[PDB]
Design a protein around this ligand. Structure first.
Ligand SMILES: NC(=O)C1=CN([C@@H]2O[C@H](COP(=O)(O)OP(=O)(O)OC[C@H]3O[C@@H](n4cnc5c(N)ncnc54)[C@@H](OP(=O)(O)O)[C@@H]3O)[C@@H](O)[C@H]2O)C=CC1
Ligand SMILES: CCOC(=O)CCCOc1ccc(OC)c(Cc2cnc3nc(N)nc(N)c3c2C)c1
Ligand SMILES: [Cl-]
Length: 206
């Protein structure tokens, strides 16, 4: 009673797998953030009466979000921190691991709760991404590929777009991305402030 739902990782990364710098994002992509918000928030209409998605994040990531945007609005936020202490918070879930997170959510949001969980997202930390990539329930990566080798100092931990991982991870057709995401999504290269990026969806079999 815990390993029911699959997990989905969402991430914006460079062709060199760069995801962050001096604790922030090394780009300003207002439309990319907008896609992040849409994907992490989307719940099918019949279910949206009573269902919410969950965002799981590292502590370094909760801190890196501008204070004005936390908790990520309209999603159940859980911060994962090996050190369950005084950090605050208007109603804010803390777990010491990804699995302890799942147990807290299934305990807190059972049939018995007015709020029901739709999809569960891991939204980063390189270190949390690492745990997710090792988790037997992670089966989907929503990747925004940034076609510039922007200087980063934090990297996504597994080269999932590369030949060595290509029998495990497969990029899906764009219509399948749109099906999963529940709307039309810009297809192909988008340019916002200096460089091209594009939305991808990768899966693996559990
Ligand atoms: N480009 C993208 O899409 C994204 C980029 N980022 C970027 O990533 C950088 C953050 O990466 P990273 O340094 O790895 O930070 P994380 O957000 O993964 O790390 C923060 C902390 O979360 C806890 N934590 C993470 N994993 C575990 C685990 N398996 N078990 C217990 N606790 C855990 C902390 O433990 P403790 O409290 O014990 O220290 C860890 O130090 C920032 O630059 C941020 O801007 C973030 C999200 C998305
Ligand atoms: C209400 C209007 O207000 C808004 O627009 C929302 C504010 C969001 O601002 C952010 C500022 C910094 C930031 O660094 C972490 C994030 C997190 C983020 C951003 N893109 C992201 N993009 C992708 N593909 N994946 C992510 N996982 C991701 C993640 C975690 C968000
Ligand atoms: Cl958001």
């Amino acid at each position: 009673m815990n390993q029911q739902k699959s997990l989905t990782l969402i991430v914006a990364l460079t062709t060199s797998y760069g995801i962050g710098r001096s604790n922030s994002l090394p780009w300003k992509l207002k439309k990319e953030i907008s896609y992040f918000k849409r994907v992490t928030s989307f719940v099918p209409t019949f279910d949206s009466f009573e269902s919410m998605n969950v965002v799981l994040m590292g502590r370094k990531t909760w801190e890196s979000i501008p204070l004005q945007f936390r908790p990520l609005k309209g999603r159940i936020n859980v911060v994962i921190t090996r050190n369950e202490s005084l950090d605050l918070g208007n109603g804010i879930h803390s777990a010491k691991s990804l699995d302890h997170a799942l147990e807290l959510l299934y305990r807190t949001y059972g049939s018995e709760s007015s709020v029901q969980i739709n999809r569960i997202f891991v939204i980063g930390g390189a270190q949390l991404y690492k745990a997710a990539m090792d988790h037997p329930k992670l089966d989907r990566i929503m990747a925004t590929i940034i076609y510039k080798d922007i200087h980063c100092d934090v990297f996504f931990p597994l080269k999932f777009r590369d030949k060595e991982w290509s029998s495990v991870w497969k990029k899906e057709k764009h219509s399948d991305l749109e099906s999963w995401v529940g709307t039309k999504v810009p297809h192909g290269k988008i340019n916002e402030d200096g460089f091209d990026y594009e939305f991808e969806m990768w899966t693996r079999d559990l």
